[PDB]
Amino acid sequence: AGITGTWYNQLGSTFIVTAGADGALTGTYESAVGNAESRYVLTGRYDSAPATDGSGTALGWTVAWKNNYRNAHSATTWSGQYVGGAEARINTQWLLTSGTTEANAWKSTLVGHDTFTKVKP
Amino acid sequence: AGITGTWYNQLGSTFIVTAGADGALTGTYESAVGNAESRYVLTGRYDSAPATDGSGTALGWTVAWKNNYRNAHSATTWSGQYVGGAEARINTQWLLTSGTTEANAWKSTLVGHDTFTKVKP
Amino acid sequence: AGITGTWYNQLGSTFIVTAGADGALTGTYESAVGNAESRYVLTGRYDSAPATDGSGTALGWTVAWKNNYRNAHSATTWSGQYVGGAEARINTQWLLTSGTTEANAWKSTLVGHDTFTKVKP
Amino acid sequence: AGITGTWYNQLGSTFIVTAGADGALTGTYESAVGNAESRYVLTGRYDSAPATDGSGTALGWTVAWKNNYRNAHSATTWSGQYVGGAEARINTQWLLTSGTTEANAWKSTLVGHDTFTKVKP
Ligand SMILES: O=c1[nH]ccc2oc(-c3cccc(C(F)(F)F)c3)cc12
Ligand SMILES: O=c1[nH]ccc2oc(-c3cccc(C(F)(F)F)c3)cc12
Ligand SMILES: O=c1[nH]ccc2oc(-c3cccc(C(F)(F)F)c3)cc12
Ligand SMILES: O=c1[nH]ccc2oc(-c3cccc(C(F)(F)F)c3)cc12
């Protein structure tokens, strides 16, 4: 609430989240454009009693890249903070782990960053 | 199932998780001391239909470090895979974001790696 | 140059680097944040024969945060790629490890992302 | 400093390094079977005046995966600390960036961890 609603990253993904009063994040992450085949469940957690000192609100969530259509055998977690105000943002770093054999585990995890805005690009 | 159970990391943290038929992860994360003040909710997702080629099962979860007793204004995400068989393990890397001001955002996020076993370390 | 030149990140740190014919990076780094004063030595490596397919040029470098003035007992590595163009950029992610006791090792390493251009924000 | 010499990671790689009086790390990194084709230049930095409170020694280094024989168009940086004493260790986290097109940049960077010892695994 501040967090609840629709967010857009800088690469074409959208998600919709509900931030519950108990610290829950629940919603849907859509990897592209608009199609059902590109929508996935997301769940996570956030600090439901953040500071009001100019600090962001810590949070994180997961998407496992399986839906009824597709399965990439991988999951992303985003860890970051919500920054409110007129130009609100969710600033994140993420980890994308694929299921691998033990021989390939060294190359199982990508890292990157995403910034989400409320304003549809 | 494989995933469902009680896991421990190398620093004794206790991760009590249930893997639901839908890809859901739910449970609690706590200290080796086992006190209520050290116990926090988690939620996450896993690949409920992993590959059949020997690969692990991708998964992730989040803990926001607030409970009824304490608030660190912080959240951790773990991204990793479950590896089944002879001795089951969950290998992860994690991101811990604390709320910061914008000027301090460059130092908001720690990274590390945790390995979980069904035995204590 | 290409890579050789004076670059600035989104915080205004100054990265003065020379790319040698032998694949070496050498130069100085001056930070806009943290326990840092004046310049610090850097060294690194870059791909001196990048792909010709439109991909960027992979590179990395290290700064240990000790100079003749101050010592923060820590080191940052930046891993990334140079992207040529009308506004050339070096896009990185970085790891900042501090020397810690073993008890504190779990919190030894910060992660982030820096973007460098030849223009100071 | 305790750093100069040959180090081995968990997975078959060998680190030969000299820690100079100027805070420089210089050497080679071999992925190998043990052969010249598997050997790559490394350079980095370390804290040459670490804390005396029992903390480790911060360091980092880079290898670009090009030698006279091959070129993976990628570079790894290791960020970590040397822990001395009876069973000395270099504990690291690493970032491997490949040169990519901008469309592929989200999948440019792998993350992981390596532990180096004085004796072979
Ligand atoms: O918007 C994002 N931000 C950070 C990471 C990330 O990964 C994806 C993504 C979406 C669909 C499939 C897959 C893969 F790789 F096949 F598993 C990954 C989207 C996205
Ligand atoms: O088992 C772990 N593995 C990775 C990260 C991590 O953080 C904690 C932890 C627990 C309580 C509070 C806090 C803090 F920092 F104040 F936010 C962190 C446990 C744990
Ligand atoms: O420009 C940057 N980009 C990414 C990381 C980073 O760290 C520093 C930095 C500079 C001086 C001291 C320290 C600390 F924390 F005390 F060790 C860190 C600058 C900088
Ligand atoms: O020992 C290690 N520890 C962490 C990372 C890492 O990457 C390599 C490595 C070696 C040769 C080629 C390549 C690639 F992928 F083609 F660029 C990577 C070795 C190594």
Descriptive notes:
4 copies of one chain form a homotetramer. Chain A is mainly β and 121 residues long. Chain A has a single domain (1-121), classed as Lipocalin (Beta Barrel). In chain A, 0% of the residues lie in helices and 55% in strands. The first copy, chain A, is built from no helices and 8 strands. Chain A has strands at residues 5-8, 14-19, 24-30, 39-46, 57-66, 71-83, 89-98, 109-117. Chains in contact: A-B, A-C, A-D, B-C, B-D, C-D. Chains C and D meet through strand 4, strand 5, strand 6 and strand 7 of C and strand 4, strand 5, strand 6 and strand 7 of D. One 2-[3-(trifluoromethyl)phenyl]furo[3,2-c]pyridin-4(5H)-one binds next to strand 6, strand 7 and strand 8 of chain D.
Number of E strands of chain A: 8
Q: What is the share of helical residues of chain A? A: under 10%
Largest protein interface, residues of each chain = C-D, 56 and 56 residues
Kindly provide the name of the CATH class of chain A: Mainly Beta
CATH architectural label of chain A:
Beta Barrel
Structural class per helix/strand content of chain A?
mainly beta
Instruction: Give me the Rg of chain A, rounded.
Output: 15 Å
Which oligomerization state do the chains in this entry correspond to? homotetramer
Count of the separate structural domains of chain A:
1
Overall outline of chain A: globular
The N- and C-terminal alpha carbons of chain A lie at a distance of: 21 Å
At the fold tier of CATH, the topology name of chain A is Lipocalin
Major sheet of chain A: size, sense and barrel closure? 8 strands, antiparallel
> Strands of the largest sheet of chain A, in order across it?
1-2-3-4-5-6-7-8
CATH superfamily of chain A: Avidin-like
| Beta-strand percentage range of chain A | over 45%
Number of helices of chain A: 0
Ligands (ions, cofactors included): 2-[3-(trifluoromethyl)phenyl]furo[3,2-c]pyridin-4(5H)-one
Helices and strands of chain A, in order, run as: EEEEEEEE
PDB class: biotin-binding protein
Keywords: biotin-binding protein, Inhibitor
Assembly: tetrameric
Entry title: Crystal structure of ALiS1-Streptavidin complex
